[PDB]
Amino acid sequence: IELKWPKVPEQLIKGDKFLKWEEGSSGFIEILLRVDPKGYFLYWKIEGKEDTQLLDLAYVRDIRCAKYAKPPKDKKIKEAGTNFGSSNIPLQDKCVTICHGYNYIDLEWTHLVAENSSVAKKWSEEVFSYAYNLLSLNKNQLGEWEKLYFRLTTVEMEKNKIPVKAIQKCLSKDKDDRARISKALEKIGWPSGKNDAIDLKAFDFDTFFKFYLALLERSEIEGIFKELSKNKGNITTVMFRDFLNDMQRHPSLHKTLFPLYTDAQCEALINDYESAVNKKGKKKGQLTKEGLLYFLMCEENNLTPMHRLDLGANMKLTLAAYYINSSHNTYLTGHQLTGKSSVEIYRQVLLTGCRCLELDCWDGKDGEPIITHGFTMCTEVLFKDVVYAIAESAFKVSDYPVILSFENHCSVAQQKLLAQYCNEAFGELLLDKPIDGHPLKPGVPLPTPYDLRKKILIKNKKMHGLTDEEKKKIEKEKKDAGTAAKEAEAAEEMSALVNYIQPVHFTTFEQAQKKDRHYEMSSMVETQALNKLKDNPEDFVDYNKKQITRIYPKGTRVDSSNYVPQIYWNAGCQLVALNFQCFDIAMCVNLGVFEYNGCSGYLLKPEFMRKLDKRFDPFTESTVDGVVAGTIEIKIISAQFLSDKQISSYVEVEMYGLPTDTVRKKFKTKIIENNGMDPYYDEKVFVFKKVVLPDLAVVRIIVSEENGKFIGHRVMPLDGIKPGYRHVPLRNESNRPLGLASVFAHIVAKDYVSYQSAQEARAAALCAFEDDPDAALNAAK
Ligand SMILES: [Ca+2]
């Protein structure tokens, strides 16, 4: 595994001097900016401010320097910045710009001037790597506890002392919870008064874990300890080994590729945990209740399968073999008809690892092409600005190829400019010619993502007996397509940039097979794709083994709502385009699944979906030959640190995959009232008895306030899911960590131990994906 934890240079730990300034103010202040030794926070002090200022790198989106930074325009700031460090270094070369946000639509900005260009560059490269570190983003609850520990001992520390005030503010705003915190500090033997402070010497991490033990009532651990110890006293080495190999391990996990734990390893692990919790009170090969809880929260018990998180997939198959992270009308940051267009949104979408973007190009009044949603009240942006934005951000988080979907409405003169600016903005990144071994002839497969690393592909038109019932459906498809229904003819300069991703008019699956052109593809509005899926589902899957389908939402979704992408991934569609600005279930799931494989934006389709000789109906309700069906059981036990106030909460568990495996609005826990710190649900297990196609499915935990307000979630693909007792750190809608907020659950995952037309039956099957499946099903009949 190539993934590494953040490694923070001593230079950044000590810190560097910067001038900090804000838009809309003429002020500036020199700060000493620092990173904690674990790469979790940027922090700095402002003279006269009580609290140390910080940025939680969990929500940092980008950091830019030099030509990509935003230099100050205010006269007084510019003069100060020019004089800061060396005046012989141009102002902009010293500038560093940071953008941060809980989600990527609502950004805030921090602007800095370094003393020189080397410092600006070093900080930009280092901080970006920490913000996008997959291990840091996936750490278990003990890791999040350690993050809090490092905040307290670096950011909040005052003259080698940790103020109690700082401990309380980091955990809760509630009076009762603050009392619990004080009592817990008292129980440990630390000062607990409102205005007291703890010495750094006495504030070690292992004692900080003893504070965790004193604070939360993890009532469930007693019964679980009794279970695993067989009620015989402490958990012995052999009992722990069997726990790890039987309960915490998928029974079908390959025993050579993923070796079983041994006695010697388990004795050693027990020593690790017992050392941390009991020190010389530890007994050889004997794990205590507190030692068990430590394990359950530590990296050894991380729910995330590291071999899947790492960029470990085979990237050397045809492009058609992958699910590719895709954005629709990417320029829009809100409503389809009344919202704003943006340049920065392109950078933000690419930073999630999204690989396929859309650019709706129109003639600008001044002779310069623009991007906007035609015939609406949306604002416009310059095409040139967008492509320079794409060129900046395209390969910052993924090396794998980007596809730009052009919806081209420009005159020939402005299309010349589109082509010109693509060339000038992208340079070498632009794939303007076929590569060796892959000419554009029939029968020649598409290149692999590996072949096309660091390349931008252009999807644009190249140079130029139906029945009445069929013609009417086609008319509806065209209407639902909106502005995409009619583009301009391709100019030769734009045509010239198109090769492997050539959009063509779809006729039939029979015709696509006959032509045998792997570089021809179709971009279908959801209405068209649904007609094909319902008419010829098996043929759709077969088409997608060699050729690419892009899907995009119909025009009636004016609020930028999304379909659930599994609907189309189930048919092997590769470019399932979503509105990234709408954080509905579809986007939550999309960002969840594409975190895996190194956040590359590419996921390899299941083998059965790539086998040319296999026929597969995604509407099947029975087991598929060659694919082992699964059973999943999820028991929601408790949650930790859901909120800084006393909230009432519940937990839901959903599954999305094949229609027959998709379960929404079925499973909901009881409400635990007035407890945001350690609610204990102890809910009866939720059973997903028969999962027909596990590798197309994900299970999802969603935590909400009683009034339905979203708190956090976690998406767990069944491919590689780890069973047993797991802490599940929660994520926000953009799939960034909430922090300490976690659900504790038990997971069973094992092999399953045993209408008037097809179209109508298939439409009914698709009701399972809706926000209210029963109501959708009732409305159809
Ligand atoms: Ca469009």
Amino acid, res. 694: P
* Nearest residue to 705 via CA among 663, 637, 643: 643
Which of 133, 166, 181 is the C-terminal boundary of a domain? Answer: 133
Are the beta carbons of 639 and 651 closer than 8 angstroms? yes
Does a structural domain hold residue 3?
A: no
Tell me the one-letter amino acid at 569. Answer: W
CA 543 – CA 495 distance, rounded (Å)? 25
Q: Whole domain around residue 518: which residue ranges?
A: 316-463+490-617
Which residue(s) pair with 64 in the sheet? 97
Same domain? For 332 and 196 the reply is: no
Distance 555 CA to ligand 1 centre (A): 9
- What's the 732 CA to ligand 1 centre distance in angstroms? 28
Boundary of a domain, candidates 238, 265, 298:
298
Q: 653 and 686 in contact (C-beta within 8 Å)? A: yes
Backbone phi and psi for residue 325, each to the nearest 5 degrees, phi listed first: -60, 120
Task: CATH number of the domain at 672, please.
Answer: 2.60.40.150
Q: Does residue 591 sit in the same domain as residue 667?
A: no
Ligand 1 centroid–CA 663 distance in Å is 31
Domain end position, chosen among 133, 152, 172: 133
- Looking at the fold, whether 168 and 261 belong to one and the same domain comes out as yes
Question: What is the C-alpha to C-alpha distance for residues 131 and 40, in angstroms, rounded to an integer?
Answer: 8
Give the resolution to one decimal, in Å.
2.0
Q: How far is CA 638 from CA 84, 172, 523, 682, in A?
A: 53, 19, 45, 6
Q: Say how far apart CA 696 and CA 607 lie, in whole Å.
A: 11
**What CATH number is attached to the domain comprising 496?**
3.20.20.190
Q: With left for phi above 0 and alpha for psi between -120 and 50, is residue 564 left, alpha or beta?
A: beta
Beta-sheet pairing, 520-525 with 502-503:
parallel
484 Cα–ligand 1 center, Å: 6
Active site amino acids? 328, 373
Could you tell me how many helices (H) and strands (E) the chain has, helices first?
27, 30
Which one, of 594, 105, 671, lies nearest residue 308 by Cα? 594
Same domain, 443 and 575: yes
In whole angstroms, how far apart are CA 236 and each of 224, 264, 271, 746? 15, 12, 11, 21
228 membership: H or E segment, kind and range: helix 220-228
Tell whether 273 and 386 lie within a shared domain.
Answer: no
377 & 288 share domain: no
Say if 767 falls within a structural domain.
no
Maximum distance among all Cα pairs of the chain, rounded to whole angstroms: 86
Pick the closest to residue 278 from 216, 206, 203 (CA basis): 206
How far does the centroid of ligand 1 lie from the alpha carbon of residue 433, in Å? Answer: 25
Experimental technique, in short, is X-ray
Find the angle CA(372)-CA(453)-CA(604) to the nearest 5 degrees: 90
- Give 191: exposed, middle or buried? Use CB within 10 Å, 0-12, 13-18, 19+: middle
Same domain, residue pair 24 and 91 = yes
**With breaks defined as C to next N over 2.5 Å, after which residues does the chain break?**
464, 754
* Residue 152 and residue 283 in one domain: yes
Amino acid, res. 467: T
Rounded CA separation 477/527 (Å): 6
Strands (E) across 473-569 are located at: 502-503, 520-525, 549-552
**C-alpha span between 695 and 309 (Å, rounded):** 15
Question: Which amino acid is present at 712?
Answer: G
Q: Are residues 625 and 524 in the same domain?
A: no
- 575 with 652, same domain: the answer is no
First to last CA, the chain: 52
Q: Are residues 375 and 513 in the same domain?
A: yes
Strands 41-44 and 602-604: unpaired
Distance 548 CA to ligand 1 centre (A): 18
Domain count, the chain: 4
Position of tokens 């859309």?
358
280 and 386 both lie in a single domain: no
SS3 per residue for 19-68? EEECCCCCCCEEEEEEECCCCCEEEECCCCCCCCEEEEHHHEEEEEEHHH
Radius of gyration over every alpha carbon of the chain, rounded to an integer in angstroms: 28
